[PDB]
Amino acid sequence: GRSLKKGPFVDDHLMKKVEAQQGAEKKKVIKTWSRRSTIFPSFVGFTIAVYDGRKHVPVYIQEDMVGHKLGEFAPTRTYRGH
Amino acid sequence: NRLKEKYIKEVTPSLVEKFNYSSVMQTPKVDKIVINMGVGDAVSNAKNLDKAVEELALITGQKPLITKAKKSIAGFRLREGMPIGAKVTLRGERMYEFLDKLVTVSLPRVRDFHGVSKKAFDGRGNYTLGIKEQLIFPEVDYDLVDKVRGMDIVIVTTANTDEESRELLAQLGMPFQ
Amino acid sequence: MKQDIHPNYQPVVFMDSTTGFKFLSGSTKGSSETVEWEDGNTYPLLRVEVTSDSHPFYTGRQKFTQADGRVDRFNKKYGL
Amino acid sequence: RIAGVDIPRDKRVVVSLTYIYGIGNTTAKKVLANVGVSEDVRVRDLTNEQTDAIRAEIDKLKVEGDLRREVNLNIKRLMEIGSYRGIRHRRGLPTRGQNTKNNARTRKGPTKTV
RNA sequence: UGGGCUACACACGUGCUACAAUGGGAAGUACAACGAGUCGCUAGACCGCGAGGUCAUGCAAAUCUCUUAAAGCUUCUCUCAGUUCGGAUUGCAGGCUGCAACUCGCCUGCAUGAAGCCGGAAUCGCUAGUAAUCGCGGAUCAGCACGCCGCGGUGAAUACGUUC
RNA sequence: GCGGUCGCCUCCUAAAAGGUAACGGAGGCGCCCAAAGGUUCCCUCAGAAUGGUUGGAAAUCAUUCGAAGAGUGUAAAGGCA
Numbered sequence: 200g201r202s203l204k205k206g207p208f209v210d211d212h213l214m215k216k217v218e219a220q221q222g223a224e225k226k227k228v229i230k231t232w233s234r235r236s237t238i239f240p241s242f243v244g245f246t247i248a249v250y251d252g253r254k255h256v257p258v259y260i261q262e263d264m265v266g267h268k269l270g271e272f273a274p275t276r277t278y279r280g281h
Numbered sequence: 282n283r284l285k286e287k288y289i290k291e292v293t294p295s296l297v298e299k300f301n302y303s304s305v306m307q308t309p310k311v312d313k314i315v316i317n318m319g320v321g322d323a324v325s326n327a328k329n330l331d332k333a334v335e336e337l338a339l340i341t342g343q344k345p346l347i348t349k350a351k352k353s354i355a356g357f358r359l360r361e362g363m364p365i366g367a368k369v370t371l372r373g374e375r376m377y378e379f380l381d382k383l384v385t386v387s388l389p390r391v392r393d394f395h396g397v398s399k400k401a402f403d404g405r406g407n408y409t410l411g412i413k414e415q416l417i418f419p420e421v422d423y424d425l426v427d428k429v430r431g432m433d434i435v436i437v438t439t440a441n442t443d444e445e446s447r448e449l450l451a452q453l454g455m456p457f458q
Numbered sequence: 459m460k461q462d463i464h465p466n467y468q469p470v471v472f473m474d475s476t477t478g479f480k481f482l483s484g485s486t487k488g489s490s491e492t493v494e495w496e497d498g499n500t501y502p503l504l505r506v507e508v509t510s511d512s513h514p515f516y517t518g519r520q521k522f523t524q525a526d527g528r529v530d531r532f533n534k535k536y537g538l
Numbered sequence: 539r540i541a542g543v544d545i546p547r548d549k550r551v552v553v554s555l556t557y558i559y560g561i562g563n564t565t566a567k568k569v570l571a572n573v574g575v576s577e578d579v580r581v582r583d584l585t586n587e588q589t590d591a592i593r594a595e596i597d598k599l600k601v602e603g604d605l606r607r608e609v610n611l612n613i614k615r616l617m618e619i620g621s622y623r624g625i626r627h628r629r630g631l632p633t634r635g636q637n638t639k640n641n642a643r644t645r646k647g648p649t650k651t652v
Numbered sequence: 653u654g655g656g657c658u659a660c661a662c663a664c665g666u667g668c669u670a671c672a673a674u675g676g677g678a679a680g681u682a683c684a685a686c687g688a689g690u691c692g693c694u695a696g697a698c699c700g701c702g703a704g705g706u707c708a709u710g711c712a713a714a715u716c717u718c719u720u721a722a723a724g725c726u727u728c729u730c731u732c733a734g735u736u737c738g739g740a741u742u743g744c745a746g747g748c749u750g751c752a753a754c755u756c757g758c759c760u761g762c763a764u765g766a767a768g769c770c771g772g773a774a775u776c777g778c779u780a781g782u783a784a785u786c787g788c789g790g791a792u793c794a795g796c797a798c799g800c801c802g803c804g805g806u807g808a809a810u811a812c813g814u815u816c
Numbered sequence: 817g818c819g820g821u822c823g824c825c826u827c828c829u830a831a832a833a834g835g836u837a838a839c840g841g842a843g844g845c846g847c848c849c850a851a852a853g854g855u856u857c858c859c860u861c862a863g864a865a866u867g868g869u870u871g872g873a874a875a876u877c878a879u880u881c882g883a884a885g886a887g888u889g890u891a892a893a894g895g896c897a
């Protein structure tokens with residue numbers, strides 16, 4: 200995996216977006232294309248609309264999801280069986 | 282005999298205090314232990330029933346009663362009376378010794394053991410513990426066994442309520458979850 | 459109790475080899491080894507791995523870290 | 539025997555131990571080295587002292603039922619958060635990026651010619 | 653910018669690993685060739701179980717490095733077991749490259765331990781340093797090959813004959 | 817004529833004794849058991865609820881409820897705890 204020295208990754212613009220909303224009793228959807236961004240503890244309680252290629256699927260970030268990339272919750276392919 | 286001494290000396294006064302019993306006779310006691318090995322596989326092969334009987338006999342120290350299908354069934358295939366299942370009845374000293382072994386050795390040897398159920402009471406103060414797998418008893422020898430089988434151990438007591446039964450069994454030693 | 463049908467049943471002392479706690483009960487199993495006992499008697503000795511005096515559930519004492527929340531895991535992994 | 543699993547009595551101690559869930563060759567060698575037991579001795583010939591030391595060393599580890607519970611808990615957590623990994627676990631598809639057009643038998647099951 | 657070309661009830665091509673004892677594991681010891689290298693090949697030392705990391709050294713090279721090759725040979729162990737075979741799958745923890753490894757890289761460690769007991773009809777390559785087998789290097793290439801190109805090590809059986 | 821039936825047992829018809837017909841309404845029999853007979857002793861069921869490993873509606877086990885709702889070789893009626 201990613202080297203420890205590098206530390207966790209999150210797109211700076213997305214991190215700024217969450218920072219601006221840290222002090223919000225009622226948070227608002229955070230729209231992003233940055234699937235690569237990791238889920239930090241500060242992300243909990245937010246709802247991030249991750250672009251899946253054609254639409255922004257909302258993902259509610261619970262504290263259990265930290266450590267995972269955002270795209271892990273926005274499947275890019277749709278398959279309903281043959 | 283050690284468990285009997287525990288019951289007579291420490292358990293009895295404590296139960297009397299807790300349940301405000303006018304007379305010592307009201308103290309619940311473990312009347313009997315019926316250990317039943319349900320063997321429906323006997324129909325497919327009787328040797329399985331024979332080995333189950335042998336194992337249960339080794340566990341209990343007594344020859345089991347080989348029960349028979351009291352009714353005829355289609356999917357279980359006994360023109361009434363075929364020998365499916367066995368049981369043993371323990372009372373007195375043998376019962377107390379077996380219960381002591383159960384609490385102190387056999388149960389600890391259960392794989393990933395996290396106690397025993399606490400809703401497994403009949404509602405009249407009689408408990409029943411379902412052993413999934415044998416080999417927890419040291420007598421089984423863990424190699425003569427070819428098919429792992431379980432059992433149902435029914436502890437029948439004189440308690441009138443599951444509360445009293447649970448108290449009695451806990452005091453006698455029962456790893457309730 | 460009927461004679462000659464039941465398995466041989468003799469007294470026996472068993473020990474939790476982990477802690478050495480021993481005590482007496484009856485069993486159909488025997489051993490090529492024996493030991494003395496209180497009250498001044500000798501019984502066959504049965505070795506056991508675990509008993510109520512050593513099993514973790516009986517003792518209550520755990521043996522692991524009880525897991526760690528994922529937020530704590532993240533902070534520990536990345537020194538945050 | 540050691541962890542509630544009757545290790546083969548006639549195998550060398552390392553091989554016998556490997557039968558314990560959560561113990562591999564390296565782990566068995568490590569525990570034997572720590573205890574001070576030669577690896578070539580068959581388990582049947584182990585003395586009670588050796589067996590007790592081995593039991594203590596193993597108990598120091600997480601093995602068998604607890605290990606299975608932990609791994610299953612991780613998989614269940616993935617499923618319940620509903621990640622891509624969780625969905626792969628749910629539908630029995632490869633979870634580590636393997637191609638599924640062919641192969642993937644280990645997860646899919648035996649081929650259904652239909 | 654993101655996703656897809658990496659999908660997946662299935663069908664078919666080409667390969668790799670296997671199904672074991674002519675073998676697995678452990679330890680010791682020997683013999684190549686073709687090629688590549690400047691911000692690249694990197695010595696030696698130290699750290700780390702390993703992937704690798706740090707310091708640092710020679711070399712634009714018959715000079716230094718990749719590069720002490722693997723099969724091989726000498727001992728020890730294992731004893732026919734779906735196993736000390738197998739290495740799929742999965743969990744955890746890591747190393748790199750890159751701004752970035754979820755879709756969707758490779759590699760390492762611990763754990764796990766899948767089908768598989770030599771394969772129906774049918775079908776393929778090969779007449780000698782060939783097949784089989786064993787490694788080594790290179791191109792593309794930040795990183796990513798069981799594929800391709802090339803190199804050498806060991807190294808056989810068979811050909812009566814042209815009816816089909 | 818063709819079809820059906822012909823002997824014996826049970827019920828309804830059958831009109832509260834008995835008996836009573838129809839090509840009236842329903843079923844059985846042409847055996848079985850060496851115990852499924854006699855006696856002495858002993859025992860009481862069917863299901864339901866709850867609890868319990870394989871085991872599921874339902875196999876075996878335990879407790880309570882349970883007067884017959886079972887069983888009585890073989891049809892029915894009567895009778896039998």
Ligand SMILES: [K+]
Nearest residue numbers: 635636637658
């Ligand atoms: K894929």
Ligand SMILES: [K+]
Nearest residue numbers: 639640641665
């Ligand atoms: K294929």
Ligand SMILES: [K+]
Nearest residue numbers: 667668798799
């Ligand atoms: K291939």
Ligand SMILES: [K+]
Nearest residue numbers: 673675676677
């Ligand atoms: K060998």
Ligand SMILES: [K+]
Nearest residue numbers: 635753756757
């Ligand atoms: K990737």
Ligand SMILES: [K+]
Nearest residue numbers: 670671770771
């Ligand atoms: K083949």
Ligand SMILES: [K+]
Nearest residue numbers: 792793795796
């Ligand atoms: K490369």
Ligand SMILES: [Mg+2]
Nearest residue numbers: 556557558561
């Ligand atoms: Mg193992």
Ligand SMILES: [Mg+2]
Nearest residue numbers: 635636637658
């Ligand atoms: Mg891939």
Ligand SMILES: [Mg+2]
Nearest residue numbers: 653654655656
């Ligand atoms: Mg694009």
Ligand SMILES: [Mg+2]
Nearest residue numbers: 637639657658
């Ligand atoms: Mg393509």
Ligand SMILES: [Mg+2]
Nearest residue numbers: 672732734769
């Ligand atoms: Mg084989």
Ligand SMILES: [Mg+2]
Nearest residue numbers: 778779782811
């Ligand atoms: Mg030719």
Ligand SMILES: [Mg+2]
Nearest residue numbers: 830833834835
């Ligand atoms: Mg009349």
Ligand SMILES: [Mg+2]
Nearest residue numbers: 830831832833
């Ligand atoms: Mg009249």
Ligand SMILES: [Mg+2]
Nearest residue numbers: 852887888889
């Ligand atoms: Mg009769």
